Amino acid sequence: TGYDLSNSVFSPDGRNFQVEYAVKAVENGTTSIGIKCNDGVVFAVEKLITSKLLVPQKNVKIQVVDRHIGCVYSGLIPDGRHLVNRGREEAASFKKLYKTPIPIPAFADRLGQYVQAHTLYNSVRPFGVSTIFGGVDKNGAHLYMLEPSGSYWGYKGAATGKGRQSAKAELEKLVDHHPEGLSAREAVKQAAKIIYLAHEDNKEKDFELEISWCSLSETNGLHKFVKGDLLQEAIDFAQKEIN
Amino acid sequence: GYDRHITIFSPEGRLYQVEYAFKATNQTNINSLAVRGKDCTVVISQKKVPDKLLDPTTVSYIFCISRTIGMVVNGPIPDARNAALRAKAEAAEFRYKYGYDMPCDVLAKRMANLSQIYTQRAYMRPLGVILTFVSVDEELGPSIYKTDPAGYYVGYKATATGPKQQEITTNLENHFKKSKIDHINEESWEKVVEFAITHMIDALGTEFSKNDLEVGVATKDKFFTLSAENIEERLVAIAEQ
Amino acid sequence: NNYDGDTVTFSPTGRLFQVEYALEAIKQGSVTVGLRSNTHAVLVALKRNADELSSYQKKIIKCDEHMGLSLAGLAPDARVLSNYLRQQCNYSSLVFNRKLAVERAGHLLCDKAQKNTQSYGGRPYGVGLLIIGYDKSGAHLLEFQPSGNVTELYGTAIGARSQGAKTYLERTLDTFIKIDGNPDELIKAGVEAISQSLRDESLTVDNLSIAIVGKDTPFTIYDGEAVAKYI
Amino acid sequence: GSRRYDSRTTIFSPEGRLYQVEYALESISHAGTAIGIMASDGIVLAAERKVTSTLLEQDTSTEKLYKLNDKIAVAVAGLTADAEILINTARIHAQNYLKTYNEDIPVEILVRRLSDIKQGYTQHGGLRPFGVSFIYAGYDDRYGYQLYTSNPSGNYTGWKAISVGANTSAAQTLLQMDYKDDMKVDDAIELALKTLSKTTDSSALTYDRLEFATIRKGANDGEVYQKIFKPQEIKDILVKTGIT
Amino acid sequence: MTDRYSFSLTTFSPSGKLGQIDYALTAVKQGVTSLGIKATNGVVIATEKKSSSPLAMSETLSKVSLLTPDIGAVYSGMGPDYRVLVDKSRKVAHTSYKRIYGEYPPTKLLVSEVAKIMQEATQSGGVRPFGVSLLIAGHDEFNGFSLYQVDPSGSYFPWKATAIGKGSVAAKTFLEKRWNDELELEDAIHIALLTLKESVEGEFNGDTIELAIIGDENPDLLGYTGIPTDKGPRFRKLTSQEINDRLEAL
Amino acid sequence: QFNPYGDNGGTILGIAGEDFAVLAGDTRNITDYSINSRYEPKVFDCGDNIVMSANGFAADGDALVKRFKNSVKWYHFDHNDKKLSINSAARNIQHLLYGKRFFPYYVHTII
Amino acid sequence: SIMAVTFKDGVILGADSRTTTGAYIANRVTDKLTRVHDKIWCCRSGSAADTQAIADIVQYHLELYTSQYGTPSTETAASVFKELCYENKDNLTAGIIVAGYDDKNKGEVYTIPLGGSVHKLPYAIAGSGSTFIYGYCDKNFRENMSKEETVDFIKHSLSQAIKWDGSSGGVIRMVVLTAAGVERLIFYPDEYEQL
Amino acid sequence: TIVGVKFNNGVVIAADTRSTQGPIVADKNCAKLHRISPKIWCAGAGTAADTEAVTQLIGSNIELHSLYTSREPRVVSALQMLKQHLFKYQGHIGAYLIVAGVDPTGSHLFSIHAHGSTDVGYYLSLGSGSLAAMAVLESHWKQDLTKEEAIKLASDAIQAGIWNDLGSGSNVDVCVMEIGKDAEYLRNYLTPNVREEKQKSYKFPRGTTAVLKESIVNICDIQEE
Amino acid sequence: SDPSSINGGIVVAMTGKDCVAIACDLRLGSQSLGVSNKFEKIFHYGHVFLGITGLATDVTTLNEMFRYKTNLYKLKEERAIEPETFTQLVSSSLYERRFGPYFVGPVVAGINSKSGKPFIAGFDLIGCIDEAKDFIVSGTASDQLFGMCESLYEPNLEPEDLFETISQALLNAADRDALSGWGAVVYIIKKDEVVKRYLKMRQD
Ligand SMILES: [Cl-]
Ligand SMILES: [Cl-]
Ligand SMILES: [Mg+2]
Ligand SMILES: [Mg+2]
Ligand SMILES: [Mg+2]
DSSP states (O other), X not given: OOTTSSTTOOOTTSOOHHHHHHHHHHHHSOOEEEEEOSSEEEEEEEEEOOOTTBOTTTSOOOEEETTTEEXXXXXXXXXXXXXXXXXXXXXXXXXXXXXXXXXXXXXHHHHHHHHHHTTSOTTBOOOOEEEEEEEEEXXXXXXXXXXXXXXXXXXXXXXXXXXHHHHHHHHHXXXXXXXXXXXXXXXXXXXXXXXXXXXXXXXXXXXXXXXXXXXXXXXXXXXXXXXXXXXXXXXXXHHHHHO | OGGGTXXXXXXXXXXXXXXXHHHHXXXXXXXXXXXXXXXXXXXXXXXXXXXXXXXXXXXXXXXXXXXXXXXXXXXXXHHXXXXXXXXHHHHHHHHHHHSSOOOHHHHHHHHHHHHHHHHHBSSSOOOSOEEEEEEEETTTEEEXXXXXXXXXXXXXXXXXXXXXXXXXXXXXXXXXXXXXXXXXXXXXXXXXHHHHHHHHHXXXXXXXXXXXXXXXXXXXXXXXXXXXXXXXXXXXXXXXX | OOSOSSTTOOOTTSOOHHHHHHHHHHHHSOOEEEXXXXXEEEEEEEOOBSSSSSOBOOOEEEEETTEEEEEEEOHHHHHHHHHHHHHHHHHHHHHHSOOOOXXXXXXXXXXXXXXXHHBSSOOOOOEEEEEEEEETTEEEEEEEOTTSOEEEBSEEEESTTHHHHHHHHHHHHHHHTTOOSOHHHHHHHXXXXXXXXXXXXXXXXXXXXXXXXXXXXXXXEEOGXXXXXXX | OGGGGOOOSSOBOTTSOBHHHHHHHHHHTTSOOEEEEEEXXXXXXXXXXXXXXXXXXXXXXXXXXXXXXXXXXXXXXXXXXXXXXXXXXXXXXXXXXXXXXXXXXXXXXXXXXXXXXXXXXXXXXXXXXXXXXXXXXXXXTTTEXXXXXXXXXXXXXXXXXXXXXXXXXXXXXXXXXXXXXXXXXXXXXXXXXXXXXXXXXXXXXXXXXXXXXXXXXXXXXXXXXXXXXXHHHHHHHHHHHTOX | OOOOOOSBSSOBOTTSOBHHHHHHXXXXXXXXXXXXXXXXXXXXXXXXXXXXXXXXXXXXXXXXXXXXXXXXXXXXXOHHHHHHHHHHHHHHHIIIIIHHHSSOOOHHHHHHHHHHHHHHTTTSBTBOOOOEEEEEEEEETTTEEEEEEEOTTSOEEXXXXXXXXXXXXXXXHHHHHHOXXXXXXXXXXXXXXXXXXXXXXXXXXXXXXXXXXEOSOOGGGTSEESOTTOOOOSEEEOOHHHHHHHHHTO | OOOOOOOOOOOEEEEEOXXXXXXXXXXXXXXXXXXXXXXOOOEEEOXXXXXXXXXXXXXXXXXXXXXXXXXXXXXXXXXXXXXXXXXXHXXXXXXXXXXXXXXXXXXXXXX | OXXXXXXXXXXXXXXXXXXXXXXXEEESSOOOEEEEETTEEEEEEEXXXXXXXXXXXXXXXXXXXXXXXXXXXXXXXXXXXXXXXXXXXXXXXXXXXXXXXXXXXXXXXXXXXXXXXXXXXXXXXXXXXXXXXXXXHHHHOOTTOOHHHHHHHHHHHHHHHHHHOTTOOSOEEEEEEETTEEEEEEEOHHHHTTO | OEEEEEETTEEEXXXXXXXXXXXXXXXXXXXOEEEEETTEEEEEEEOHHHHHHHHHHHHHHHHHHHHHXXXXXXXXXHHHHHHHHHHHTTTOSOEEEEEEEEETTEEEEEEEOTTSOEEEOSEEEESTTHHHHHHHHHHHOOSSOOHHHHHHHHHHHHHHHHHHOTTOOSOEEEEEEETTSOXXXXXXXXXXXXXXXXXXXXXXXXXXSOEEEEEEOOOSOOOOO | OOGGGSSOOEXXXXXXXXXXXXXXXXXXXXXXXXXXXXXXXXXEETTEEEEEEEOHHHHHHHHHHHHHHHHHHHXXXXXXXXXXXXXXXXXXXXXXXXXXXXXXXEEEEEEOTTTOOEEEEEEOTXXXXXXXXXXXXXXXXHHHHHHHHHHHOOSSOOHHHHHHHHHHHHHHHXXXXXXXXXXXXXXXXXXXXXXXXXXXXXXX
16 A cells, blocks of 8 residues: 555556545536537536635636636535636637637647656646536537546536535436537526535535626627626526426 | 657567557557558447447547548547547648648658657657548548557558557458458449458458448548448448458 | 655645645734725735744735735735735836736746646645725725635635634624725624634734825825724 | 665665675675785785686686786686676776876875776665675885775775685684785795685685786896796696695 | 556565566566577577568568677566567667777677666566576677676676576486587587577578677778778677578588 | 847936936837837836836847736735835846846946 | 639639749749648748748648547638737738638638737738739739639739749749638649749 | 759669869869668758768767667658757758668658758759759759669759859769668769869979078877887 | 078978888977977877977977877887878877867878788878878978979889988978078888988078
8 A cells, every 4th residue: 555645656556646536636526517409518516605705707717718718616615716717728728729729629638648647656646626618619519527636528517616516417408408509598597406416415505606608609709707687587487496 | 667658669679668659559449441442541440339328429549630641540539539630631731832732741751750759758658549541642542551659650551559469460461462462452432431341341351231330431522431321231242242 | 644745746536735734824823804885995904923022923915006916825925925016016017007916926837836736846835815906897806825716805814713703704794895995894794703703802003003005095094003093 | 756666776774784795795795705815025815716617618717816906816706707797897997097197106096986887886876786805915115015905885994914714714714824924935935825715615625716917026126026837737736736 | 647656566575476477487488499609709699580470571670680780689587578669778888888889899788788777677667677697698809709688687697608598408408418618609600509509499591590700800891991900799699501501410 | 140239229317306306218119110109108117116128129129027016016025014215126127137137137226 | 922812612722833032033943822721721921931830820720629628710820810910010921812611601701910910801912922913913803703703713813923033943832721621733834823 | 052852762863073162163173962771862051060060970879879779770760850950040050951762661852951851852953053953953853763764854954053052162972862762872973164274384493492401300209218 | 480480491291112111300489489499290109100290389289299199109018109090190190189180181101010011101191191192291381392303203212212202392392481491300110120211401
């Protein structure tokens, strides 16, 4: 034993226990989800209201990369911010050289390679976040989810955090009941519901819902936050479904 | 017992971190197979999409390194993509510096040397992957060259990699014992892919749908992967005889 | 236990013990309170002395004309972080002729603290900060933790016995937020809040430290007989 | 991080000893014995090759005696590969001195330089020391014939007669017994071989298990000649002195 | 990142042993047998092509490698370590010699450069020693034919004949009885094949044996004509057929 | 060839009274024979009851004033809001100017 | 004398074949139409060494781009050229016209003059001999020409450029970029001089 | 004067043998034909030290590359390595080369200039006598030349330079690289400039020169005994 | 101003039958001013001889450099360097200073100890090898030396005849150069004996 004391060390299994311990930090975090719709993607996250002293709608968790990519994550929040800062550098240098905004699959690998690099040495710690991200490019909509190991895949729906099992079950129903697809406005409503349903795992404290979306028709392929009436409409739909 | 944590010699003269990287290779539970035709080199690999939420089009362990070279990986995807990106960069740099397309065997050697360095230098860990490079080389013809975490590499008539590699290896061995040639004597790549799939079915003892497989084909001056419908056509031909 | 030797090591449950130990240094530090209305933001800090011959350690640092913070924990780390804020506030002014947003100031602190938690050789910052400011979107109050977590709040408190002041503010939330255009009443609420964290000792003239920033009020610190008014 | 695996090669023990230097000296104590004897008219270098084979090509082999320049030579005891690193450095230093001052390097200056390099590895860098002890045999016009020794600590000392490697305790006693100040090279040759013959762990001392050299003013008029003995010449001097 | 292993991973133990070098030698012991024999008019180096799979093409894996036109190398131990050493050995022959003196280095000096690289892996920061022992055969104008062994420590010794790896102890005893100072190259090749048969279990033929010589100049292998002083490489790898021909007269 | 310097004209004047001081300057900014601005302030209040003007090449003048104003700000931070005396400001400006001795601020400064 | 012209089915690149060292024609059969990708080519003018070095670097960048992100756009290729030409403007003398065919965007033409600036145009002319055909090309160019019309337009235009510019001459090379593929054309002096 | 001429089954290069410092002839029999690899040769004009040095360097790296890849070297590899090196040094390495050779891809002929620009052709010429040579090549070259015709054309182009260009002179060196064959280096293929016998012998009577001192020089090492 | 003609001086080398000869003047000056008449320009490393003309500081520096390199060569190789090998070493060493060269005109002379073949070679200041059969010239009166050598020289001269030819080539060439003369030395080299002769010449 001792194989779990240092990053980048293979155990006799062929496992990197430090990365597996980083996953535990992710599992401890709040719930975040991603839904791929007809012409775009929708991101949503659970924000635990630790106290009444928290200013509503101020501690924004979802982050934009470039102008067409949204990123949300569960686990250690600073680690997620560090990853997004890198993502923004990667996207900037891509656009600087190639002119076109970075494609989502291209952007996914940039994060993937960077996170994977933090599993190669004992002088660094793995990332304590699973990141759900995506957006619209020339080839259409893309949704991704990126783990501490650097592993990522494309998704129809994605979920991570403490209420991931509950969320996943809900996402699987949507995939089955909508083979032709889901609209952007529908996805926002469904996203609100799923976060509310996934809040049963964090039922002690009350929470604040935060949603964002990129859609070719609804937002011109740009990342925007769901605000005001459209947000309230989604909250009402969500509250109706739990009762 | 820190001789098991970093790449230094144990009293037996062994490198345990290298041996444990070999074990990570089978973590995906995927089997790959590569064979050579007359004009082509075919590589097939099991495709497993366990989650319904996954976009199955993005789930792949076959990579297009250059126009001519293709690479299938046995091991975790992060290390797989690490190796893929490097191999792409190395292939591009080679063409720029030396004015011709990097051969499959030379790329394999280069990646093998990089892997060797990780077994000797302490700060760098080995990658938990086995890289199988395929092409139709302009000098050597159809080529299969495979690299592992030890930094070892060699050319192959055919090869198999994964948990059930031995069953596939023996199946292929027995075929080449009959035919007494170093390749599949077939004109079209379509029939070489059919051979590859047929012999994987026989070795593993499992039937395959169009979404259970992943196929890569190398011809002269290009390497390409088959779509689900291209594979379906391949599976239909197998069943009809 | 075996996973607290350095900041680069997760525990089997996914915890970073060196960060948690740095968090512990804040709890040992003297209490400080932050709270705001829509017009003004106030810092109140209980300063700590070594003995009767010694001075009372300063708790509040000015970062710009419109921004500053109070500290709890390792004071030298607060000097490093406050110096960084001063530079960032200053870079924003010189280059963009733009006063640095309090929210963006928090984002910069978060990212600076984060780098120290993921790299080998270094250590996390051993201090907590309460940043107040008045920018283009009004009054603000932030709470900085050396884990990297920064949080915008109406009011809060950090340090030893800070839970008492934090509960008081949680009750008074609806009252003190409405104290607009009245600095003295907002400070009173802050002085009354920090009083809920006192035991044995009481607020004296060289014990209490208060700071305020607002609409037409530059960040100014009050010490000595300037705070006798509020005792 | 990396600290976990650091042996810390450059630290003191509680007793004030340098661990790695002490262990390097232990390594050197198993190496083939090398002897240096200084006379009034020259210096002798004798050394024992370690358990050789009949299939070893002796006439082209060199593991003990090396040439630094025309005036200075060294006998090695320890890791041969380590010694060659230092030898090439020493050879360069001598050439640098010659280029700068247009005079051959004084023996002590060369010895000090190599000894300073060894010292560095014991104080900084975190690397293992060179597992090598040298016997320097050389001549210059200031001090004449000189014998020095250096060890992994980087400490060097001057000698009339000295041994390094295996069985130095026994060897040094035998040299101390028969050495005299008015001794000559031919007598010193005999003493060196007699000492090795008694201290050797082998059954008998033969030509194929020896390297031998002399630095003589026995060169035509006021100048110095180095003589690295050939296998046949070592065989002849063994018969002459009456050992075989 | 940065390589933070700036300290030695090979250190002296209380007994005076350098553990990592000893363990590297143990890895060499496990390696497949290779040997070298020096004749009056040439040198022969040989080893077994231990194929890891019958599907593998063992011709693509070269255990015997050309370093210069007149110098060749073979090994026992870890193949990947050998491969990178050959790359460095080939390059150092150019950078530290040919680009200076306009000619290829003599065997002993190229061996010295290889030895130096292996010594440095035994002392430098954050590296393990090379897990190979090399046998380097070669020729040059002023030293003639020579055969050198190079160990993980960086130590090197010239040999009349020797063996390394699996069955070296038995093979060296076999060579001691057969070797003399009047051997012709063909006699050395014959002895090499006899010695190598003892350590081989399975198939013993031109396809499972790798054998090269340092002998006469090969003007047919030069690639060009028109310069009298250039007469072609002395290094030559024997073909599968050429080996089998000599196995009939075995 | 690129000439990194220019001449923005103008003229400044400082007079020290018994218990007061004045620093005057025209508001015209020019290049060659053209007027850039009829009102471009040249004399600045730098805080701590100090006024400053760097006349000549306006780009270097604006840079210097900007850097001195900055120095006043940091002097307060580093030395407990102590007032920067005019003699201390003068010495500080000497170091700002001489810091670019081999690529000068092409200005005549007065405080 | 180089030019690139967009038309209905795609784009055509055209160039002369003269390379000069002063008044000596160092090469009379030069190929100034160079390939940076399957259907992205460029026209080179100025220093032959600079323009070759640039084109080689671009080809490397687009080969690596393709391996990671698939086929690049013509706009992307022009941006890589621009980045090299702009950032190394003090040390380069290169006037390049980038032309390519997408299926989505069809035929596109970008010109990159000395400074390193980029200009997207329906057609572009460059090189020393371009000066003499500004009037002709402006008067005779139409959008959505046929392949045969565009070939005639380039042939006639470069013919005049060759006629008047001593730095230009030899054969008129052309490269046609369409959905159909890549076609190389050549026109000899006896053909184009009598026009 | 250096030339290169393609033919049916390969390529031939040729060169004169004059080296000059100003109006003076430094060497009358200089070797301007260099070997990069066994079947890749190049001729060099311009600064002599540069053509030699740049050829040796690339030839060294080509050899190492050939060993690394287990393949025979290609002309495009030497061409690419040369041009990138020369380009990097912005023409300051005064090497003007004609690179030719045969490899598994076929037979090739290229020119290289000091600033790093390369050109392809069936016939090429470089140096101060390139205009005299090119005049001959433009007059007599045709497609589908035989080996014998190409050698003739190549040497005739060099002769044009020898006679008409003052920067060129002495002898003609040739190298023929045919596909599927060893490259044949023909040093002093033509010798049309042998000096005539002198009218007089200038051998002096012994003791003609006045001497002050004599002494034996010790070249041997320090002696034994 | 021109570094190659501040100090002045010349060197010439010739081949004979089983012998070589190398000679040089003894002048060192500061343009018009004569400073030394004992500045020898020929050095030797074992049996290989090297003459160096040009800037005197570089002549001295290179000598010290090649002594340095040939001494290490000998320790490692366990044999003396040969003329052909040394020639390549000189070329290599000079070209490494391609864009900051030593202002010299080296001349190598010697006999291969194994083959017995006579060898001479010349270089430019940056390493180009001129390996002539007949003769090599260098220095401020190289034009003069070229004319003398080209007319006086004939192949296969015996050592004692070769001495007269090279001596008259140097002497009469130096007498037509303002920056050469002030004495002269001639080395006659055979496979295992070397004779050095100082020549009597006009001292203006
Ligand atoms: Cl490599
Ligand atoms: Cl061109
Ligand atoms: Mg490692
Ligand atoms: Mg024209
Ligand atoms: Mg004179």
